[PDB]
C-alpha cells in the first residue's frame, strides 16, 4: 500500500518469555526460541542464526515443541508441523479453546487445551513423518484433578501419558483413553514438572520452594527439597553422569543444588529480569555440562561446568525495553548502535549472521537522550558521544573495542546535557547544556578547547558543515545560532515563531531541517543563512525525521501515527504511512536502500525498503484512517521487391525506409528502371524533416556501387528526370555547412582569444 517503503525485517529479537524447545541436529542439538508470531532456530554449540519461520502465524504461539527434525507450533486452534522453518503440515483442533501444552511420544501427539480437553493424534504408519489423524479426545473433569500444568512422559511408559494438574498427577492409557492411575491430593500447587532419567520418578516443583521427588509406579514421595521463598519456574537435570538439580526461579536466580551429596552448589543472581518473568526455561545439554537459560528480557545465556561453580560461556541478547535512540555505525551497512531505556548499549550486525554485542561499560549507566557517532576514527580514539538523562557530563565510547571511553564531558555551567554532536573528521565534540553553553572538545585528548554561551535555554541540536566552517545551533528560546568554526565569531542568528526540539543536518547539501513547536518543519539553507522551507500538515508532534541521502526526501514520524514522506522539489507531502505501532526512530541508511525504525512496542527494529528500481510517482495524501556506426560501417577495411512495386504505383516508401532503418546494412541488399523509384523514395525521404543522416548514407551508397549503372554513357535520359528532381532539393539541403563553419570558427577564435 505504501508508495516508497515495504516492511522488511525486524532486528533485535531473541526471546519473549515462551520456554524454548530443544531438538536433535545429527549429533548436536538445536534450540527453538520464540519471538511472537515468529520463531528462531539456533545451534547449540555455537549459537549461529540457522533458521526462522518463513511465514507469520495468525496469532502469538503459545507452546513450542521439537521432535527429531520437526517443530510443532501451538496457537488458537492450530498446530504447525514445520521442518527447516517450512510449513509441512497444519492441524486444526476441533475446538475453539486455546492450546496450552504438547507432548510427543512413540506414535502420538498430545494437544492440551485450556478447557481441560486434550486431543490425541496417532500416526497412520509408524514410519510416517507425523501424526495426522484424530484418534481420541480426553476430558479432565474437576472431580478428577486440578488444572493441567504440563504434559510429560517418563522412561519405559509405552502408551501412557503423564498429565500433571494443580491438585494431583494423572496417568493415562492413551491407546484406550483409560486413566490407569490417579494420585492423591497434593498440598502445594505445582508449577514446574521435569522428567528424570531414572525410572518411574518425576520431579514436581511447587508454587513454593519444594521439589517433590514423586514415584509414578507406586505413587509416593522418596524425597522433597525445601527452598526458602522461591517460586519454581524451570527445572533441569544434569545428564552427563553427575546427578544434580537446577531450579529456575521467578526472581531471575538459578539454584544449583547437589542431589547425592545433598548440598546447594550455586545460585546465578539475576541473570534474567524478575520484571520480565525471570528464568523462563533452563535446560542442561544431554551428556554435556552446559545449561542454557532463557527469559522474557530478549536474551538467552549459556553456562558451563568446568571440572565447581558454573562458568558464563556465551549469550545472545538485545534490549529488554523498546529502543529509544539509534544510529547507523557504518556506511557499509553492517553495524549499528542501538540504545534503549533499559540502560543497555547494544551494537548490531546486519548480515546473514545478524549478530549483536552489548557495549562494555568497563550499576548501569543512566538512560540516554542523545547519540553522536562518526566513522572516520574507529580504533584510533573514541568515536561515540552519549548524552544521558539528568547528567551534567557526556560519555565517550569506542566502537572498535566495544568498550567505554576515558573521557567524561562536564558542561561546566551546572546544566544537564541536552545535545551532542561530532565533527566528520572525528576530531571535535560539540555539546549543548541545559543552560545554553555549547563547548567544543577534542576527541583525541578529551580537552576543553572552546566554549560558547548565546542560548539562555536548553540547546536542543548542534551541527556543523562537513567543511568544518559554519556551526549551526537551535535553542528553546527560538534562537538559531550561526558560528564560524575557525574563529569564535557570531556569524548570524535567526529567530523563529516556535522553539526547536531537534536538529538533523544534511552534510553534502548543507541543509538542516528543524522540528518546531508549531507543528511545522523548517528546512534551512545554511549558506544563505535563510529559512527556505517549512512543512505543514502534521496534526501532532514529530519525534523523528531524517534526510534522504540524495537530499530529496524527508520521512518524518509523528505522534498522530503519521510516517510521512516529504518531497523537497515540490515542498509537499507525497506519502503518509499510517501504522498501529508508531515508530520512535526513523533513520535513513547511508546507502539509499534501507530504513531503521524503532517502535513503541517491540524491542526489535523494523527495517523499511525503498524499492528504488523505478518510480515516476507523484500521487497524494489522506486516505484510510549509433550515429557513427553506420557511416563508419560504410567503409570496409579488412522480400523488398514487393515494396518497391507497391511504391511503384503510389507513395509507399515509408515502409521500405522502415525496413532499411530497422536492420540490414543494405549495400549488399540494394545490389539485388527501379532506381528511378529509388530516387522517388529519396525525395519522399527528404520530404520529412528528420533522418537526413541516413539519407546521406543512402545517396552515398547510391553513388558508390551503382554509379556506373547511373552513368549509362549517354546522359540526359529519363534518369536525369529523377536526378533533376533530386538536385533542386539538394540545393535546399546545402544550407547547413556555413552554420558549422560559424560554430567551429567562433569556438576556434575564443580558443585563441
Amino acid at each position: 500500500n505504501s508508495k516508497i517503503f515495504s516492511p522488511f525485517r525486524i532486528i533485535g529479537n531473541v526471546s519473549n518469555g515462551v520456554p524454548f524447545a530443544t531438538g536433535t541436529l545429527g549429533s548436536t542439538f538445536y534450540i527453538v526460541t520464540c519471538v511472537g508470531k515468529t520463531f528462531q532456530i539456533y545451534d547449540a554449540n555455537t549459537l549461529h542464526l540457522l533458521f526462522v519461520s518463513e511465514k507469520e502465524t495468525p496469532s502469538s504461539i503459545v507452546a513450542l515443541s521439537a521432535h527429531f527434525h520437526y517443530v510443532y507450533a501451538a496457537y488458537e486452534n492450530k498446530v504447525g508441523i514445520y521442518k527447516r522453518g517450512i510449513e509441512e503440515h497444519l492441524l486444526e483442533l476441533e475446538t475453539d479453546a486455546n492450546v496450552e501444552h504438547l507432548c510427543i511420544f512413540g506414535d502420538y501427539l498430545c494437544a492440551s487445551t485450556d478447557d481441560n480437553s486434550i486431543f490425541i493424534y496417532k500416526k497412520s504408519d509408524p514410519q510416517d513423518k507425523y501424526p495426522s489423524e484424530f484418534y481420541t479426545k480426553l476430558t479432565v473433569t474437576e472431580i478428577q484433578g486440578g488444572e493441567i500444568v504440563s504434559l510429560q512422559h517418563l522412561a519405559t511408559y509405552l502408551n501412557k501419558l503423564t498429565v500433571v494438574t494443580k491438585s494431583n498427577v494423572l496417568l493415562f492409557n492413551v491407546r484406550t483413553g483409560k486413566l490407569v492411575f490417579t494420585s492423591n491430593e497434593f498440598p502445594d500447587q505445582i508449577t514446574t514438572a521435569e522428567p528424570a532419567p531414572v525410572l518411574d520418578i518425576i520431579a514436581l516443583g511447587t508454587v513454593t520452594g519444594e521439589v517433590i521427588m514423586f514415584n509414578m509406579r507406586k505413587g509416593k514421595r522418596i524425597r522433597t527439597i525445601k527452598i526458602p521463598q522461591s517460586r519454581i519456574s524451570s527445572l533441569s537435570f544434569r545428564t552427563d553422569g553427575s546427578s544434580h538439580l537446577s531450579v529456575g526461579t521467578s526472581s531471575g536466580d538459578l539454584i544449583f543444588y547437589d542431589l547425592d551429596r545433598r548440598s546447594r552448589i550455586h545460585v546465578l543472581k539475576n541473570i534474567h529480569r524478575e520484571s520480565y518473568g525471570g528464568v523462563t526455561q533452563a535446560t542442561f545439554l544431554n551428556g554435556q555440562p552446559i545449561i542454557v537459560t532463557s527469559g522474557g528480557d530478549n536474551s538467552l545465556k549459556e553456562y558451563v561446568f568446568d571440572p565447581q561453580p558454573p562458568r558464563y560461556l556465551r549469550s545472545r541478547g538485545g534490549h529488554s525495553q523498546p529502543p529509544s535512540y539509534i544510529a547507523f555505525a557504518d556506511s557499509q551497512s553492517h553495524f549499528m548502535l542501538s540504545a534503549s531505556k533499559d540502560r543497555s548499549l547494544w551494537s548490531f550486525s546486519l548480515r546473514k549472521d545478524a549478530q549483536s554485542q552489548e557495549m562494555s561499560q568497563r550499576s548501569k549507566f543512566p538512560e540516554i537522550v542523545a547519540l553522536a557517532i562518526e566513522n572516520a576514527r574507529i580504533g584510533e580514539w573514541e568515536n561515540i558521544i552519549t548524552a544521558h538523562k539528568d547528567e551534567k557530563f557526556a560519555r565517550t565510547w569506542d566502537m572498535r573495542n566495544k568498550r567505554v571511553g576515558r573521557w567524561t564531558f562536564d558542561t561546566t555551567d551546572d546544566g544537564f546535557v541536552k545535545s551532542v554532536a561530532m565533527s566528520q573528521c572525528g576530531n571535535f565534540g560539540f555539546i549543548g547544556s541545559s543552560n545554553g553553553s555549547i563547548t567544543i572538545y577534542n576527541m583525541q585528548s578529551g580537552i576543553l578547547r572552546k566554549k560558547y554561551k548565546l542560548h539562555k535555554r536548553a540547546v536542543t541540536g548542534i551541527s556543523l558543515d562537513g567543511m568544518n566552517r559554519k556551526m549551526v545551533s537551535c535553542g528553546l528560546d527560538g534562537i538559531v545560532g550561526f558560528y564560524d568554526f575557525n574563529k569564535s565569531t557570531l556569524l548570524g542568528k535567526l529567530k523563529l515563531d516556535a522553539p526547536i526540539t531537534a536538529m538533523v543536518y544534511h552534510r553534502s547539501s548543507d541543509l538542516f531541517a528543524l522540528a518546531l513547536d508549531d507543528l511545522s518543519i523548517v528546512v534551512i539553507d545554511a549558506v544563505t543563512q535563510r529559512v527556505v522551507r517549512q512543512l505543514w500538515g502534521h496534526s501532532n508532534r514529530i519525534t523523528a525525521f531524517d534526510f534522504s541521502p540524495e537530499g530529496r526526501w524527508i520521512v518524518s514520524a509523528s505522534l498522530d501515527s503519521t510516517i510521512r514522506t516529504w518531497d523537497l522539489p515540490t515542498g509537499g507531502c507525497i506519502d503518509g504511512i499510517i501504522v498501529d505501532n508508531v515508530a520512535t526512530n526513523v533513520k535513513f541508511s547511508p546507502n539509499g536502500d534501507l530504513l531503521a525504525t524503532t517502535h513503541v512496542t517491540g524491542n526489535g527494529i523494523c527495517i523499511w525498503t525503498n524499492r528504488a528500481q523505478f518510480k515516476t510517482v507523484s500521487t497524494r495524501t489522506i486516505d484510510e484512517s549509433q550515429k557513427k556506426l553506420d557511416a563508419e560501417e560504410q567503409m570496409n577495411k579488412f522480400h523488398f521487391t514487393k515494396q518497391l512495386r507497391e511504391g511503384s504505383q503510389s507513395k509507399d516508401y515509408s515502409s521500405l525506409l522502415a525496413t532499411l532503418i530497422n536492420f540490414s546494412p543494405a549495400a549488399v541488399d540494394l545490389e539485388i528502371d527501379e532506381i528511378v523509384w529509388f530516387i522517388d523514395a529519396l525525395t519522399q525521404g527528404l520530404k520529412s524533416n528528420k533522418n537526413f543522416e541516413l539519407y546521406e548514407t543512402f545517396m552515398s551508397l547510391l553513388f558508390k556501387a551503382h554509379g556506373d549503372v547511373i552513368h549509362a554513357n549517354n546522359k540526359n535520359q529519363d534518369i536525369a528526370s529523377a536526378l533533376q528532381n533530386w538536385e533542386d532539393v539538394h540545393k535546399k539541403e546545402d544550407r547547413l555547412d556555413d552554420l558549422v563553419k560559424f560554430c567551429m570558427g567562433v569556438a576556434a577564435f575564443v580558443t585563441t582569444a
Binding site: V532, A612, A747
Partner: protein, 755 residues
C-alpha cells in the same frame, strides 16, 4: 564538487581469470573478471553492474532465460542477486565452499547446484524483492555419487538429469521424483578420463567425450540396452581437452585445448571444419551463442587476457588485449580517448568510454614508465625505460623520432612545452635534464644543476617557467626562453617525489617525505599541509594532481585509497578501494571535468558525476510548483522559464522546457540570461549534445549562447575552457562527419554536366 564519486566503469576488460557467457538476446556480452562482476553489451560497450562481495578470486555468472536473475560465484561459494543495475536485492549466503557445476532450469522454475560430492536443487523465485532470510527452498536432493560432479546437462522437459563426475560415470537423476526410465544409469567403458558429457536435444543421441579426444555416442535405449553408435581412437593429437561445449543447433562441437588452439567439429560427420592456433597460452573457458552464430572463448590469467569473437564462417568480430598492470595514464586533447602503459613494453589505444580498442604501438625494448600527449593532438609521446623517447601520431602510423644520444637505460620523468617546440627529459641516475628540438632532435645545451636525482618535471601554461622536483630537498625553477636562469628555492623539509602545478603559473603543491601534502604560491608561502595517511589493511605520497577547474587537488599514495582536497584546508572526500591481496601510481584530471585518472595494478576508471541527487542552486522552492509554474511559463515569459529551469535539476523537465520554445525567442533569451546561471548549462550541453539526434536544434542554441557573452567567458576562463572543450569535441566530431558527405553529394551535379 559535492557529487558521489565511484566506478560505474573501469580500466581494462579482463585482468583476472573468469568465466564467459553471452546473453539470451545475442546483443549483450557478459565479460567477468576475478574480483568484480561487470556486464557489457554488443554495441557501445558500457559497464553495467558491479557485484563485489568476494574475498577469493573466481566468479561464475549466468541468467535464467530472461536476464533478470543474475548470480556470481566465488571460491567462498555464496550468492548475490541483482536485477539490472547492481542493486544486490538478495544476498543469499549459500556455502563456505565453492561449486564445480551450476545450471538453471530452461523454464526458469528450478535451480541446479553441484558441490561436495552431491546434488542440490533449489527453488528459483520470480521477479520480486528481498524480505527473505532464505529465498531459496530445497526442491530435491539426489544421493548418492562417488565423488564431485565435474559437468552437468539438463533437459528441455526439465525433469531429466544427465550428469557426469570425476568417477568417469554419467549418472541420471529425475527432477520431480518421476524416475524417468526408472534408473540412474551410469555410462562407462571409457579408456581415459571423461571431460565432457552432453545430451542432444532430440532425446535420441548421447554425446560423450574423453580427454584423449575420443568421442563416443550412445543411444537412448534402456538387444534392449544402450548400444554403441560411434567410437574413436586418436593418438596423434598430443594435447589435453581443456574446455568443451555443445551447440543448440545439435550439429556441431567446439573444442578448446590446453595447447593454445581451438578446434571446430561437426557431430554427424566427425570432421574438422578448421583448427585455429594463435599461440601456446591455453583457452580456459568457452561460451556458445544460443543459436550458435558467434564463437567466443575465455582464457587464463597466466595465459592470454585476450578474448576474440568469431563466427561459423571464420572471421574475427571483436578483438581485445589488456596485458599487465598499468603504470600511467594520459588524457587525449578531447579526453574521450585513453592510452595505456604497461610492464610489457606496449602502448595501447582505448576508447574505453565505448570500450573499443582501435590500435596499439609496439616498438619498445622494455617497459613504459609514463605516457603523455600534446594538446595540439598531432603528436603524443613515449616515456619509457627503453633508452630512448619516441614521438607518435594518432592515425598515420609513423614513429617520428626516437630521441636519445647518451648512454642511458633509465628515462624516468619528462616535460614538454605546450608549443611542442622543445622536449626536456630527466635522467634518473644521471644528474642532467636534456632538451631536444622539434626540428631534427638537437641537443643544444645540457643542464647540469642537480645534486639529487630528478623526481618530477612540470611546465606551466604561462609558458615561461619550468618547475622541477628532485631528490635533494630542493625545488627547482628554470627559464629557457629568456636570457638566463632563475634562482631555485630551498625547501624546508622533505625530499620530494611528487610535484603538482597550476596552469596559471601561480600555485604549486608538493608531496612531503611523508603523508603531509603542502601547497604554496610562486612566492613560496605555504598554504596547507595535509595530515599523514591512515588506513591499515608505512606512508606514501607517490602521486598528486591539481584539478583543472583550479578548486581542488587529488592525492594518491599506495595504501589502497584516494584522497580529495580543495583550495582551502579541508578534505573533500576519501574514497577507499576494497580489495584483498601497492595501488596508486598516477593521478591526473579529465579535460572535460567529469572524472579523473588512476593507474593501478587492477585498473579502474571513472568517477561518475551524477544529477539524480537533489541540489538547491538558487533557492528552488521560491519557485513553488516545479510543473504548473513551468506550464504557465511555456505560454508566457520565456525568460523566467529558463531562470526557473536552471534552479531545477530534473532532466525529464530540462529536455521539455528546453525543447518547447520557438526559434526566434532563442537570441532574446541568450541576450538576457544572468551570468551565474551559465557555466553548468554550458558544461552540460556538450555532453548532452552527443546523444540526441537534434543537432540543428542545439546548434542554433549554441550560436546564440556562444555569441552572447564571449568577452565575459573570455574573462572567466578555466571553467568555460572545460565547457568549451566539452562542446568543441562535439563540434569537430560532427563537423568532419557532415562536411565529407556534403562535398561527396556536392560534386554530383557538375559530374552530370561532365558525363
Amino acid at each position: 564538487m559535492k557529487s558521489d564519486f565511484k566506478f560505474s566503469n573501469l580500466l581494462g576488460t579482463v585482468y583476472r581469470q573468469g568465466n564467459i557467457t553471452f546473453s539470451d538476446d545475442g546483443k549483450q556480452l557478459l565479460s567477468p573478471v576475478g574480483n568484480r562482476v561487470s556486464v557489457f553489451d554488443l554495441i557501445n560497450n558500457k559497464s553495467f553492474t558491479f557485484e563485489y562481495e568476494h574475498r577469493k578470486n573466481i566468479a561464475a555468472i549466468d541468467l535464467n532465460k530472461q536476464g533478470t536473475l543474475l548470480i556470481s560465484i566465488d571460491e567462498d561459494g555464496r550468492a548475490i542477486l541483482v536485477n539490472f543495475k547492481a542493486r544486490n536485492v538478495l544476498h543469499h549466503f549459500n556455502f563456505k565452499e565453492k561449486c564445480s557445476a551450476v545450471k538453471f532450469s530452461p523454464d526458469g522454475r528450478l535451480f541446479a547446484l553441484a558441490s561436495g560430492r552431491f546434488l542440490q536443487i533449489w527453488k528459483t523465485p520470480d521477479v520480486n524483492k528481498d524480505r527473505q532470510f532464505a529465498p531459496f527452498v530445497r526442491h530435491r536432493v539426489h544421493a548418492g555419487h562417488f565423488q564431485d560432479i565435474t559437468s552437468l546437462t539438463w533437459s528441455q522437459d526439465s525433469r531429466f538429469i544427465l550428469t557426469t563426475s570425476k568417477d568417469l560415470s554419467a549418472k541420471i537423476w529425475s527432477v520431480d521424483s518421476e524416475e524417468k526410465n526408472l534408473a540412474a544409469t551410469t555410462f562407462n567403458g571409457h579408456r581415459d578420463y571423461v571431460m565432457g558429457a552432453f545430451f542432444s536435444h532430440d532425446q535420441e543421441k548421447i554425446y560423450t567425450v574423453s580427454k584423449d579426444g575420443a568421442v563416443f555416442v550412445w543411444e537412448f535405449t534402456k538387444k534392449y540396452s544402450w548400444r554403441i553408435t560411434k567410437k574413436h581412437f586418436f593418438y596423434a593429437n598430443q594435447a589435453k581437452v581443456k574446455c568443451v561445449t555443445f551447440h543448440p543447433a545439435t550439429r556441431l562441437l567446439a573444442v578448446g585445448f590446453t595447447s593454445g588452439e581451438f578446434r571446430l567439429y561437426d557431430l554427424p560427420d566427425f570432421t574438422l571444419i578448421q583448427q585455429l592456433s594463435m599461440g601456446q597460452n591455453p583457452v580456459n573457458t568457452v561460451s556458445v551463442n544460443q543459436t550458435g552464430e558467434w564463437l567466443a572463448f575465455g582464457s587464463s590469467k597466466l595465459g592470454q587476457l585476450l578474448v576474440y569473437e568469431w563466427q561459423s564462417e571464420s572471421y574475427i568480430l571483436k578483438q581485445q588485449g589488456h596485458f599487465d598492470s598499468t603504470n600511467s595514464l594520459a588524457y587525449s586533447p578531447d579526453g574521450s580517448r585513453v592510452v595505456t602503459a604497461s610492464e610489457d613494453g606496449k602502448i595501447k589505444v582505448w576508447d574505453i568510454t565505448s570500450g573499443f580498442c582501435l590500435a596499439t604501438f609496439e616498438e619498445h625494448t622494455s617497459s613504459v614508465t609514463a605516457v603523455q600527449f600534446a594538446k595540439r593532438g598531432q603528436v603524443m609521446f613515449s616515456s619509457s625505460l627503453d633508452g630512448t623517447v619516441r614521438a607518435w601520431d594518432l592515425i598515420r602510423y609513423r614513429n617520428f623520432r626516437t630521441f636519445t644520444g647518451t648512454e642511458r637505460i633509465q628515462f624516468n620523468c619528462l616535460a614538454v612545452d605546450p608549443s611542442g617546440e622543445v622536449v626536456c627529459a630527466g635522467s634518473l641516475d644521471n644528474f642532467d635534464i636534456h632538451v631536444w628540438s622539434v626540428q631534427t632532435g638537437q641537443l643544444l645545451d645540457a643542464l647540469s644543476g642537480h645534486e639529487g636525482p630528478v623526481s618530477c618535471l612540470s611546465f606551466s601554461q604561462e609558458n615561461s617557467v619550468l618547475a622541477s622536483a628532485s631528490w635533494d630537498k630542493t625545488i627547482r625553477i628554470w627559464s629557457i626562453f629568456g636570457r638566463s636562469q632563475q634562482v631555485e628555492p630551498i625547501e624546508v623539509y622533505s625530499d620530494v617525489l611528487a610535484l603538482s602545478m597550476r596552469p596559471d603559473g601561480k600555485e604549486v603543491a608538493v608531496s612531503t617525505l611523508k603523508g603531509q601534502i603542502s601547497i604554496f604560491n610562486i612566492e613560496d608561502a605555504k598554504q596547507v599541509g595535509n595530515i599523514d595517511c591512515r588506513k591499515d589493511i608505512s606512508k606514501f605520497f607517490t602521486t598528486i594532481h591539481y584539478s583543472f577547474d583550479g578548486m581542488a587537488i587529488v592525492a594518491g599514495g599506495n595504501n589502497n585509497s584516494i584522497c580529495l582536497y580543495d583550495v582551502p584546508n579541508e578534505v573533500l572526500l576519501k574514497r577507499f578501494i576494497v580489495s584483498r591481496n601497492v595501488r596508486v601510481t598516477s593521478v591526473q584530471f579529465s579535460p572535460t571535468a567529469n572524472a579523473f585518472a588512476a593507474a593501478s595494478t587492477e585498473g579502474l576508471l571513472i568517477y561518475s558525476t551524477n544529477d539524480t541527487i537533489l541540489f538547491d542552486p538558487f533557492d528552488l522552492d521560491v519557485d513553488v510548483t516545479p510543473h504548473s509554474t513551468v506550464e504557465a511559463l511555456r505560454e508566457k515569459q520565456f525568460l523566467n522559464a529558463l531562470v526557473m529551469a536552471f534552479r531545477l535539476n530534473e532532466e525529464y523537465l530540462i529536455n521539455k522546457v528546453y525543447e518547447a520554445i520557438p526559434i526566434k525567442e532563442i537570441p532574446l533569451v541568450a541576450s538576457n540570461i544572468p551570468a551565474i546561471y551559465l557555466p553548468r548549462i554550458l558544461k552540460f550541453i556538450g555532453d548532452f549534445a552527443i546523444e540526441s539526434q537534434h543537432i540543428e536544434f542545439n546548434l542554433i542554441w549554441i550560436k546564440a549562447l556562444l555569441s552572447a557573452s564571449g568577452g565575459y567567458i573570455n574573462e572567466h576562463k578555466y571553467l568555460f575552457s572545460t565547457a568549451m572543450r566539452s562542446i568543441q569535441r562535439f563540434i569537430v566530431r560532427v563537423a568532419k562527419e557532415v562536411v565529407n558527405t556534403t562535398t561527396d553529394n556536392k560534386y554530383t551535379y557538375r559530374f552530370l554536366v561532365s558525363t
